[PDB]
Structure 1
């Protein structure tokens, strides 16, 4: 019939916060920013309705629906003279695409002591599905008002409207009283965030100078060592943990068997150790650098906050799935600090996602199966608040065995009263306090390091034939090292370690940016895994 045109303004001079939204700006162009929490399914919205009159069964079309259901006023045929009786026929109508995004305030915009504010943004036209939960997006559009009947009972004189009863010619109950209570909503004509698996499409849409530096970084010889030195520059001296974090942020490949075992290639890491050993400063570094990374604490989390919940905004309203921490970090990292403090039920809930990389919620009439493809970087404290060197890793941790199995690497960090090490940690802490960023000297800035990781995540590493046999030999060597009699390993070795080794080798191959897994990569993965085990 007719093409509907979407004018999409962008690049506004200023960006507003959710709490900077005021009623003076209703029906005006402006830009806001916020973190997406919930997105609606795209739904059809009546744009140009068609109406049939009960008297004159003609068809009046192109009845513009501006913002609400609006019947026409005059019939096409002059004889009918009807205005109030019409029927909407849906096929003969026109519709647009509508999505309602819910956006919370950004974590850096919430004031002191206040709670985050939420706003309902309306995406229309081609901007639907451009925002997904977890992403911080800025929207440009109209600040509008929508009816809000929940303002009943609120203090103040709520506005109301009455029909004018003068000039009406009574003869000697026609109330027509409505409630003019509204709430501020947003109608976005432009969304930008503030499928990449193919390598060539990723390199094609990328600036030439960045290609210059990326290929220089690939041409570098100690690229692995430089990458490790560029991970968490503020932390001093934990290099095995930085190696593990880099490999986790790179990741392996996802492999599905014939019958669908669906082997997962996400490295899960646990960091345990003595107090004040920088364990939470590595989780702090990962969130804020790794894309789609979600940080949470053990005691401030629930099974419905980590996995998806079934919530209800309005009593008498339906139920919805608001996405959990394990889904806002999808294809990313969930940094759970103080894993030990977390309750047993929450641990079982996280176990349900570590086994199948999926979460099943069957509560309230919603039976959805959500997928949670996330790597879990956990920080934990041993029981008693201090690591026991003469006790196994399992005896040190209250963490349940089903959870403990899915962790590929266990980095145990212990502090000691070493004269030189203490003198040098203290110099770094005080120089990190005196200077702000001059005390941090990483080989790569966060920008180009993130670019390199984004590039290296596009590879499918393959191991050559000699790599298979050496993997077998290294697994044999690990098994021989374990159960020796005097080694007394913290946690014992099984075929889960062998799978950990394969995915670690794939991550190392991604780090070196090669599609073939050299046996030296398997050797490096074997060393990294073996040094993680601590002898009792």
Structure 2
């Protein structure tokens, strides 16, 4: 009703692209660009077409990592109590099923009761976890499985089933050293396989260290969080007004058929022509799926900007996003 006037009042504002970000997660301090992707995980791409056929993704993924007490927990607990049907786990003992079917016994009078379980219900929603290294490899399989087939088939000695999970997924697995190790190639730095690695675009590493200016800022900004007051400090947007705005942003299916998409190609060419040498840098390859997420990147961008068919300048943004995303794998 009158709420939509707020949208038109919101849609007119240019700086909201910045404001949406500053309004993202004030409980957290800084980290900036990491925040945006959260919103970006909150609106995926078309996650649809193009026939005949296969349904192209769609979705998106991030696992942000760094020194413990980075308060990376701030993000998950933020959106977990923020976005609807946002599901979260300790990411260590689900145990396995968890996401797997038990499969449940007995009945009684029967057996083989099929639980989903766990991450299904987040379907078409943002799923977040912690420390894949804690759940080991056993579920990394199916975890990677859900990352390919999306919806997963399951059973044990029961009746066959294929369960639908199309779910935006993020998580955080602490560094094996919890530190850097800057010279560490992110590829071997993560204590996990490339396919689950290449599947999520992208993890977006961040690190923390003492800065006396920020140490006072942390001393300042963080304590106000501890503060009963001032709680008066606020982001530009009420979380709710943006969330309803989110759905308005959700309605869109922006499609860039614009010939600037052609410009994106060499941008991918220019993206990976350099990565041929050396391979000891952020490579990867880079993955061709990266261009796919590069698609879903713009898929996330246009929604925030509300305009269909996007733009190359926007294309640069997601491109540059990957660049820093990738450069975190550098050194």
What's the TM-score bracket when you normalise by the shorter of the two chains? over 0.9
Among candidates 26, 32, 39, match of residue 239 of structure 1: 32
Following the alignment from structure 1 to structure 2, what is the Cα–Cα distance between the partners of residues 314 and 254?
A: 38
Structure 1 position 324, deviation (Å): 2.2
Change (3 A) 1:494 1:349: closer
Q: Deviations over 1:424-479 (max 9, x none)?
A: 12211111112367155111122112111111111111114232122112112211
Following the alignment from structure 2 to structure 1, what is the Cα–Cα distance between the partners of residues 120 and 216?
A: 43
Following the alignment from structure 1 to structure 2, what is the Cα–Cα distance between the partners of residues 238 and 389?
A: 18
Following the alignment from structure 2 to structure 1, what is the Cα–Cα distance between the partners of residues 258 and 170?
A: 32
Following the alignment from structure 1 to structure 2, what is the Cα–Cα distance between the partners of residues 486 and 395?
A: 12
Following the alignment from structure 2 to structure 1, what is the Cα–Cα distance between the partners of residues 178 and 269?
A: 35
Following the alignment from structure 1 to structure 2, what is the Cα–Cα distance between the partners of residues 277 and 483?
A: 33
What runs of 5+ residues in structure 1 fail to find an aligned partner?
Answer: 1-207
Which stretch has the larger CA shift, 517-526 or 358-367? 358-367
Higher RCO structure, 1 or 2 (CA under 8 Å, sep 6+): 2
Q: Deviations over 1:135-161 (max 9, x none)?
A: xxxxxxxxxxxxxxxxxxxxxxxxxxx
Following the alignment from structure 2 to structure 1, what is the Cα–Cα distance between the partners of residues 63 and 93?
A: 19
Counterpart of 1:212 in 2: which secondary structure?
A: helix
Counterpart of 1:475 in 2: which secondary structure?
A: helix
Change (3 A) 1:487 1:425: farther
Structure 1 position 299, deviation (Å): 1.3
Following the alignment from structure 2 to structure 1, what is the Cα–Cα distance between the partners of residues 230 and 67?
A: 28
Structure 1 position 490, deviation (Å): 6.1
Between Structure 1 and Structure 2, the one with more strand by share is 1
Structure 2 residue 253 is matched with structure 1 residue 460: yes
Following the alignment from structure 1 to structure 2, what is the Cα–Cα distance between the partners of residues 305 and 502?
A: 32
Counterpart of 2:2 in 1: which secondary structure?
A: helix
Name which one, 1 or 2, has greater alpha-carbon Rg. 1
Q: Deviations over 1:266-317 (max 9, x none)?
A: 0111111122112111111111111121011221323321244432464334
Change (3 A) 1:268 1:346: same
Aligned CA-pair RMSD: 2.0
Tell me the TM-score normalised to structure 2 length: 0.93
Structure 2 residue 241 is matched with structure 1 residue 480: no
Following the alignment from structure 2 to structure 1, what is the Cα–Cα distance between the partners of residues 70 and 91?
A: 18
Following the alignment from structure 2 to structure 1, what is the Cα–Cα distance between the partners of residues 279 and 229?
A: 48
Counterpart of 1:320 in 2: which secondary structure?
A: coil
Between Structure 1 and Structure 2, the one with more helix by share is 2
Q: Deviations over 1:340-392 (max 9, x none)?
A: 21121111111111101111113242211101001111101111232321111
Counterpart of 2:213 in 1: which secondary structure?
A: helix
Structure 1 position 486, deviation (Å): 9.8
Following the alignment from structure 1 to structure 2, what is the Cα–Cα distance between the partners of residues 455 and 413?
A: 31
Following the alignment from structure 2 to structure 1, what is the Cα–Cα distance between the partners of residues 106 and 17?
A: 49
Structure 1 position 235, deviation (Å): 0.8
Structure 1 position 229, deviation (Å): 1.3
What runs of 5+ residues in structure 2 fail to find an aligned partner?
Answer: none
Following the alignment from structure 2 to structure 1, what is the Cα–Cα distance between the partners of residues 93 and 234?
A: 34
Contact 1:307 1:359 in 2 (8 A): no
Contact 1:305 1:325 in 2 (8 A): yes
Contact 1:490 1:534 in 2 (8 A): no
Contact 1:466 1:519 in 2 (8 A): no
Among candidates 513, 518, 525, match of residue 318 of structure 2: 525
Counterpart of 2:297 in 1: which secondary structure?
A: helix
Change (3 A) 1:330 1:486: closer
Contact 1:254 1:263 in 2 (8 A): yes
Counterpart of 1:453 in 2: which secondary structure?
A: helix
Following the alignment from structure 1 to structure 2, what is the Cα–Cα distance between the partners of residues 439 and 296?
A: 32
Following the alignment from structure 2 to structure 1, what is the Cα–Cα distance between the partners of residues 211 and 181?
A: 19
Aligned length: 329
Following the alignment from structure 2 to structure 1, what is the Cα–Cα distance between the partners of residues 153 and 279?
A: 44
Contact 1:307 1:350 in 2 (8 A): no
Contact 1:308 1:323 in 2 (8 A): yes
Following the alignment from structure 1 to structure 2, what is the Cα–Cα distance between the partners of residues 329 and 308?
A: 16
Contact 1:336 1:379 in 2 (8 A): yes
Contact 1:309 1:321 in 2 (8 A): yes
Q: Deviations over 1:50-98 (max 9, x none)?
A: xxxxxxxxxxxxxxxxxxxxxxxxxxxxxxxxxxxxxxxxxxxxxxxxx
